[PDB]
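Sample 1 of the test manifest.
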Amino acid sequence: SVQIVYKPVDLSKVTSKCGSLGNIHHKPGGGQVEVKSEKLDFKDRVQSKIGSLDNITHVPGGGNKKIETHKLTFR
Amino acid sequence: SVQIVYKPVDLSKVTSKCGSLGNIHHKPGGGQVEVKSEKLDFKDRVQSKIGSLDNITHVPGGGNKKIETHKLTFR
Amino acid sequence: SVQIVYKPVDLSKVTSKCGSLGNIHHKPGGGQVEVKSEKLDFKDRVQSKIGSLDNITHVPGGGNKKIETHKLTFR
Amino acid sequence: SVQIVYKPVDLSKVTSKCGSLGNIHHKPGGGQVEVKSEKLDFKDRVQSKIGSLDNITHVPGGGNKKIETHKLTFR
Amino acid sequence: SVQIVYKPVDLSKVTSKCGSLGNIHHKPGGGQVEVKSEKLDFKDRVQSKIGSLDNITHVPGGGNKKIETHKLTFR
Amino acid sequence: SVQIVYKPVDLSKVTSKCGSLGNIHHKPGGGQVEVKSEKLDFKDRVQSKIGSLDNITHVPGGGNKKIETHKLTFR
């Protein structure tokens, strides 16, 4: 016979405290961008991106992450 | 016979404290960018990116991470 | 007695010839401009200019100048 | 008695010839400009210029100058 | 008695010939410019210039100069 | 008695010939410029210039100069 008892006990705290969060500045791509092309040949697919793309400013007041995984596998 | 008892006990604290968080400046790509192309041949796929792309400013007030994994595997 | 004879003779030619004049590009001030000011005191006059000012593109097809001065002064 | 005879004779030619004039590019101030000021005191006049100012592109097809001065002074 | 005879004779030619004039590039101030100031005191006049100012691109197809001065002074 | 005869004779030619004039590049101030100032005192006049100023690109197709001076002075 088989007796399996799973008792994870968790009283944990991922925590933060901040008095003031501010005066943040993200300025990507302030310079000038110039692209000149003459006489090109493409025989397959083309992807182009030109300018200021996919810039992120992420300012979470908290920003706490807790990841927990439980696997109980029985053969 | 088999007796298995799993008792993880956790009272942990991942924690932070900050009086003031600020005066942060991210300025990518302030200079000028110039691209000139003449007489190119491509016979396969092409990917191009030109300018200021995928710049991140990440200012979490807290920013605490806790990762916990439990595996109980029985054959 | 006094005899004064002034005979300037001029058959001159300031001249130009141009087959094609073109494909000219003047781009001042393509970059980004940022001005932040806190807690200033001025006790006299102030002049400020901010941005793209007084840029000239001057493309005279001819552009020929002839300056001629005659002074005949008699005491 | 006084005899004065002024005979300047001029058959001169300031001249130019150009087949094609072109493909000119003036790009001043492509970069980013940033000015931060805190706690200044001025007790007299102030002049400020910030950015892209007084840039000239001058493409005269001809551009020939002739300057001629005649002074006949008699005491 | 006084006889003065002024006979300048000029059949001169300041001249140029150019088949093609082109593919010229003037790019001043492509880099980024940053100016930070704290706690300054001025008790007299101030002049400031910041950025890309007074840049010249001068492409005269001809560009020939002739300067001629005649002075006949009589005491 | 006084006889003065002035006969300058000039059949001179300042001349040029150029098949192609081109592919010229003037790029001043490509690098980044940074100026930080704290706690300065000025008791007299101030002049400041910061960045890319007074750069010249001068490409005269001809560019020939002739300077001629005649002085006939009589006491």
